[PDB]
């Protein structure tokens, strides 16, 4: 649902109410109906409320970055003149209530209304199409309330303590109704560890197996539960069949729960459960009593001492620079490192000082907002202030925002903040331009066929083995391995097969593969599709937005482009290799990078020669070929650290990156075919893109890479 101002609804549905009221004989003719509508007669409102019966209406917010920027709701008449937005769909909209406005559209035809109702309904779009993580998340206030609800505070009121000889434990409770009665009085608190018998909730899998046996349903049998009453209340909001969780409800815990819910339950169920979670979190957020004053922002007592000790570390350095032993750049770097260490130590002291019940500590630890660096900037040590050119001022601030800045420290902080605020305006414009180019290049990639019956595919690393011998899970699995289709059977030690070909390759498939000891699997991707036009459904794999197999006519090219270019505004450069939006833009333009890295051409030992102003490299072939010499390797570049660190005379790979930086895609192409370029481009863009903490499935980039490599050149006429 979504709210809608009465006047705006009247103006939108003018012909609709016109007909619906001239039919009910309120107005004799159409002209009289128009006159009533413009005068806003009282009879108009009733028929207006009548005509909005199940009529979908689209809501949009400029800028519309990704697909979920337009959502079809159902409108409810509301007084005032403000469109009422559901709080959950804000994150998908990137909408905020500082004064942002929203545009409203009205579908007309039966086809248009059907498309709005079935395709673009808000309750049907929970998972983000980019990475698959839910976008209808319980947000800041809701997650704070849920976190406070399920905390297990030791030594609380009405705690369960065993006793003998004199009186029983007197902490156990019969039913959650009894627990609610006790909580209504002062005897029992919400976050007190107690023991309850439960009948309407499914016990966890291990308890179910140990006690209930094979027939372990929830509704009938009762079971002991060592939990808090708040956890019981929270679990009551989940669907009936869901097992009891009994966990501290951090943001990622709810993430796993809702992801599993969307994976293994119908869409209406997960929508209703998310609504229930929002309501419960909002109710408990106010009861949590999170509120901040100066007493809540305490300072570390050790800070001054630290701010003294490092100060001495500064002074001697300055004195040494006064002696001429340390140059200006050396002094600046030494001061920068000393003050970085001082900031880290002050942050550690602040962490060790803050109690875990402090409102700011639970705000940051709930996963709701901010990071501890923000609190350190609040109280303790602000940090290092940057320069307009991008350097670090050797004389940093020492106080913090809580203590109050002076004139000059505020001046330099303003320097840095103005730089940061100014860069974003250009950054987001460049992101929009990149998104437009990405949409234009991949517009021809749409699913046409269900399956192309190909055998070519893409190998994925999938938790390579450790030297000691074990299956260490690869960190990047939900990006590359998940949501694929196996191109070849996964068979261990030439024995039984574990996962057959053409499988969805979900979580059970993955942990089965890891248990079997298999690490290498070839999945069917879009880089090997045999369809002449577009990509087949099986090759594209599972669609992230719905979690099921992709449809037959879905336009995955535009979805990929929008997913790649949506979180582009969150990209930032580090402190001659670029690593921000310019880096990914130059990767997607297939141009020569600034930090060019020459690569080997023939397998063999190397010849390193320290030249003047520039180093020299010569790869001597292992066969009767020419000794390939690279000339322009300036002294600025550093030698690659691959395998001990590379040195002269070591055996190198046919396309080994000799010099640090970023290899040009054309060179690695003409040296190692198209597959190596696909691997390199995907890995580099993913490394640049996730260094900010942004997750995108690999096939979205794979579509663009395929569109890059579609064409071929001509050598002979």
């Amino acid at each position: 649902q979504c709210g809608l101002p009465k006047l705006m609804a009247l103006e939108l549905f003018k012909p609709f109410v016109m007909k619906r009221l001239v039919d009910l004989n309120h107005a004799q003719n159409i002209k009289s109906a128009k006159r009533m509508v413009e005068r806003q007669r009282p009879q108009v409102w009733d028929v207006l409320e009548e005509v909005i019966a199940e009529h979908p209406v689209l809501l949009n917010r400029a800028p519309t970055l990704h697909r979920l920027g337009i959502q079809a709701f159902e409108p409810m008449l509301v007084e005032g003149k403000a469109i009422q937005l559901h709080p959950l769909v804000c994150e998908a909209f990137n909408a905020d209530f500082d004064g942002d406005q929203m545009a409203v559209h009205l579908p007309l035809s039966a086809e248009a209304q059907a498309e709005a109702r079935i395709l673009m309904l808000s309750s049907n779009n929970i998972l983000s199409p980019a990475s698959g993580r839910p976008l209808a998340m319980p947000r800041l206030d809701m997650v704070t309330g849920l976190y406070y609800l399920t905390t297990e505070v030791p030594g609380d009121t009405g705690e369960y303590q065993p006793a003998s000889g004199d009186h029983p434990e007197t902490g156990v409770y019969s039913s959650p109704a009894e627990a609610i009665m006790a909580a209504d009085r002062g005897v029992l608190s919400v976050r007190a560890k107690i023991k309850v018998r439960l009948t309407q909730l499914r016990p966890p899998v291990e308890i179910e197996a140990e006690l209930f046996g094979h027939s372990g349903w929830q509704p009938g049998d009762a079971w002991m539960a060592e939990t808090t009453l708040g956890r019981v209340m929270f679990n009551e909001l989940l669907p009936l069949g869901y097992p009891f969780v009994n966990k501290q409800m951090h943001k990622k815990v709810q993430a796993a729960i809702i992801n599993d819910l969307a994976e293994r339950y119908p869409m209406i169920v997960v929508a209703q459960t998310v609504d229930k979670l929002k309501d419960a979190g909002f109710y408990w957020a106010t009861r949590s009593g999170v509120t901040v004053s100066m007493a809540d922002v305490l300072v570390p007592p050790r800070k001054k001492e630290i701010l003294d000790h490092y100060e001495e570390r500064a002074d001697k350095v300055e004195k040494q620079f006064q002696r001429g032993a340390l140059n200006h750049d050396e002094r600046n770097e030494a001061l920068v490192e000393i003050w970085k260490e001082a900031t880290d130590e002050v942050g550690q002291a602040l962490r060790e000082h803050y109690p875990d019940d402090n409102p700011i500590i639970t705000i940051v630890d709930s996963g709701a907002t901010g990071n501890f660096t923000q609190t350190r900037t609040l109280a303790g040590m602000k940090g290092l202030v940057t320069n307009p050119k991008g350097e670090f001022i050797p004389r940093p601030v020492k106080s913090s925002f809580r203590e109050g800045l002076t004139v000059l420290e505020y001046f330099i902080n303003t320097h840095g903040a103005r730089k940061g605020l100014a860069d974003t305006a250009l950054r987001t414009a460049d992101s929009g331009y990149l998104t437009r180019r990405l949409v234009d290049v991949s517009q021809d990639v749409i699913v046409r066929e269900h399956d192309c019956q190909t055998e070519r595919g893409i190998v994925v690393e999938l938790a390579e083995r450790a030297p000691d011998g074990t299956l260490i899970r690869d960190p990047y699995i939900e990006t590359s391995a998940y949501a694929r289709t196996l191109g070849t059977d996964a068979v261990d030690e030439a024995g039984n097969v574990i996962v057959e070909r053409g499988q969805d390759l979900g979580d059970p498939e993955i942990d089965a593969l890891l248990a079997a000891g298999i690490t290498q699997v070839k999945v069917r991707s879009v880089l090997t599709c045999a369809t002449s036009t577009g990509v087949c459904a099986t090759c594209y794999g599972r669609s992230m937005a719905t979690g099921k197999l992709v449809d037959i006519g879905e336009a995955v090219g535009i979805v990929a482009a929008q997913s790649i270019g949506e979180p582009g505004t969150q990209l930032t450069m580090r402190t001659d290799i670029t690593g921000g939006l310019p880096r990914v833009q130059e990767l997607f333009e297939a141009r020569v990078p600034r930090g060019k890295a020459p690569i080997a051409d023939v397998t063999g030992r190397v010849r390193l020669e320290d030249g003047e102003r520039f180093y020299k490299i010569t790869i001597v072939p292992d066969d009767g070929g020419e000794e390939v010499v690279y000339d322009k390797i300036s002294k600025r570049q550093r030698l690659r650290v691959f395998k001990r660190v590379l040195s002269d005379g070591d055996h190198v790979e046919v396309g080994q990156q000799l010099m640090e930086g970023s290899a040009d895609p054309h060179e690695v192409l003409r040296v190692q075919g198209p597959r190596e370029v696909q691997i390199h481009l995907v890995r580099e863009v993913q490394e640049v893109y996730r260094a900010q903490g942004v997750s995108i499935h690999d096939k979205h980039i794979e579509v663009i890479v395929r569109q890059m490599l579609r064409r071929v050149t001509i050598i002979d006429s």
């Binding site: 009733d46 007084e79 003998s164 007197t170 019969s174 609610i180 005897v187």
Partner: protein
């Protein structure tokens, strides 16, 4: 002063003892005023009978297990905590039940004196085995609300006495919710929805009637300052 729209009270039963009462339409702001008051008075006003203390032979200081039966004693405490009873006499009545040998001990084995009745004969209590003998004593008293365990004053006389938390209230759980139905042409009234779960001894209709009765008496106590004092009026029935 005529409200001009009579609020109504409509119920749709769900189970044998479960119902939802809907009250609509209401003067804006009154939904919470009625809802919270009804929710509190429902579980804190209706008189009811419940157990107060328990004693069983074979345990005097070992508050973990009792021989003959296999399950612990806290299970027995919970089971006879979840007993519905009706008593017409205010004195503590004594409940007895004695089973010999292997078998299933249920609440129906309780022998009630006249004036004390149990409405759940078929509730499991224990699983005796190995020619076990189990004798159970209960103390039943009537009152109101929900009272935690009360320490046994006669510890010396009754050392086997064990205090237990007591569900006096005949209703188990009531929740309330306020919606904002039908606001535009009827100046922003709201709807109250109450969901009630009571013990099978009494019906939710009677529970609501008694709660309304006691609340009406309590509020007419406040009204009995001016016999005539103009306010709101409701209308015909």
């Amino acid at each position: 002063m005529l409200i001009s729209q009579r609020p109504t009270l409509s119920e749709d039963v769900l189970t044998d003892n479960r119902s939802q009462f809907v009250i609509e339409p209401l003067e804006p702001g009154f939904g919470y005023t009625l809802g919270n008051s009804l929710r509190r008075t429902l579980l804190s006003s209706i008189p009811g009978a419940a157990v107060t203390s328990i004693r069983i032979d074979g345990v005097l200081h070992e508050f973990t297990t009792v021989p003959g039966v296999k399950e612990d004693v806290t299970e027995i405490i919970l089971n006879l905590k979840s007993l519905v009873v009706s008593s017409e006499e205010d004195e503590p009545v004594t409940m007895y039940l004695r089973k010999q040998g292997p078998g299933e001990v249920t609440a129906g084995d309780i022998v009630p004196p006249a004036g004390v009745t149990v409405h759940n004969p078929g509730m499991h209590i224990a699983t005796l085995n190995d020619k076990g003998k189990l004798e159970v004593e209960l103390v039943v008293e009537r009152g109101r609300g929900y009272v935690p365990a009360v320490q046994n004053r006669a510890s010396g006389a009754e050392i086997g006495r064990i205090p237990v938390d007591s569900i006096y209230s005949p209703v188990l759980k009531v929740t309330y919710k306020v919606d904002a139905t039908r606001v535009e042409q009827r100046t922003d009234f709201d709807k109250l929805i109450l969901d009630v779960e009571t013990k099978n001894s009494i019906s939710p209709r009677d529970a609501l009637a008694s709660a309304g009765k006691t609340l009406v008496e309590l509020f007419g106590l406040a009204r009995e300052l001016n016999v005539e004092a103009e306010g709101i009026e409701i209308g015909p029935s």
